[PDB]
Amino acid sequence: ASQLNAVVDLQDRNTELSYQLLLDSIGDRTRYFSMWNQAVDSYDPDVRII
């Protein structure tokens, strides 16, 4: 009825990186959760550093 949008979004926010850093602080990020496709990007440590 009031039609007043409660989501005020600002384009100098990074909601994606705010969620990537939030999952690190609350849980073990190495684990794989398929439902949210929660599988963190991870290079091999012996390929980067020879």
Partner: peptide, 28 residues
């Protein structure tokens, strides 16, 4: 609100009082 709490024995298993809000930020 002891009727909402599980009973470990005959005492209500309550949480702590000051554990209600969050305070975490990106380094702070």
């Amino acid at each position: 609100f002891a009727s909402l709490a599980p009973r470990h024995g005959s005492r209500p298993f309550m949480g702590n009082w000051q554990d209600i809000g969050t305070s975490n930020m990106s380094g702070g």
